[PDB]
Amino acid sequence: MAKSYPTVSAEYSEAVEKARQKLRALIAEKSCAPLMLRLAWHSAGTFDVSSRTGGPFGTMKNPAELAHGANAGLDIAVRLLEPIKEEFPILSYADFYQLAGVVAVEVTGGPQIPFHPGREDKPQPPPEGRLPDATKGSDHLRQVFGKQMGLSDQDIVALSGGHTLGRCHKERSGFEGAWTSNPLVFDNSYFKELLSGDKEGLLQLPSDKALLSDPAFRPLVDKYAADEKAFFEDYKEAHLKLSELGFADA
Ligand code: HEM
Numbered sequence: 001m002a003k004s005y006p007t008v009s010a011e012y013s014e015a016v017e018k019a020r021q022k023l024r025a026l027i028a029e030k031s032c033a034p035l036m037l038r039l040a041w042h043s044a045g046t047f048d049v050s051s052r053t054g055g056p057f058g059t060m061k062n063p064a065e066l067a068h069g070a071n072a073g074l075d076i077a078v079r080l081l082e083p084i085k086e087e088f089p090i091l092s093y094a095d096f097y098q099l100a101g102v103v104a105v106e107v108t109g110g111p112q113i114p115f116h117p118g119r120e121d122k123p124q125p126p127p128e129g130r131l132p133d134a135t136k137g138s139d140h141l142r143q144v145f146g147k148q149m150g151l152s153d154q155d156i157v158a159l160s161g162g163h164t165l166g167r168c169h170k171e172r173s174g175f176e177g178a179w180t181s182n183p184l185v186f187d188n189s190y191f192k193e194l195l196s197g198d199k200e201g202l203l204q205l206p207s208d209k210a211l212l213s214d215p216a217f218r219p220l221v222d223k224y225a226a227d228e229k230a231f232f233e234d235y236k237e238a239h240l241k242l243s244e245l246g247f248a249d250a
């Protein structure tokens, strides 16, 4: 009961649904779901509960947030979606980019994540530097996901499984390569590749590897590697919370 969702007009709700359908077509047709998940996650993951700044409030449209080092390449995502956004002026960018993240998981075979409309577009981006550093470990993950975002250790491990989609690019993050052999399929392969150790053709970041040595994260890796259904359930709950940080709080 931690949420009290706002009431939106019937027209707002109709625009959400029509935009959802257009996003499902575009994201599938252009094979860009991993980029769109990263767009939604980088939009939301800047929330800091202590100041209630950041979070999924549309600020990735702002060129100054697009210029953050961690957001290299997301300008492509923003531009690819703008022709659809122009057809739905009633929608906030905040809702629109979180809807894109939800659709990205759906169209790649993942769980159906609930979506509640009504986020406001806020004028100021968060400061740069809130998002997790791929070179750091478990203490840093708990500081970012836990002390800033308010998310649980389970959420950290489940959300790291978003790396079942897509890849790193040398000109964006500077890392290069995919975590899985099927980077357009949302499944639990990420955790299986982590457990098997490194292999030719695939990438693991130090932040991925921190999940394996931590005594609280590791049992969750084990669980998700063995049980895709449990991974999908926990991923769904964690993505929902992430997509609503700072939004509709009771
Ligand atoms: C746990 C800490 C995390 C770190 C350190 C991290 C870091 C990174 C880095 C360095 C890249 C490469 C970007 C590029 O070069 O294009 C990346 C890509 C990606 N990240 Fe994360 N990430 C984390 C968590 C997450 C979460 C929570 C999600 C969503 C649930 C996510 C989804 C993705 C996806 C889908 C890609 C591929 C993007 C593409 O293929 O264009 N990651 N991440």
Ligand code: NA
Residues within 6 Å of the ligand: 164, 165, 180, 181, 182, 183, 184, 185, 186, 187, 189, 190
């Ligand atoms: Na995959």
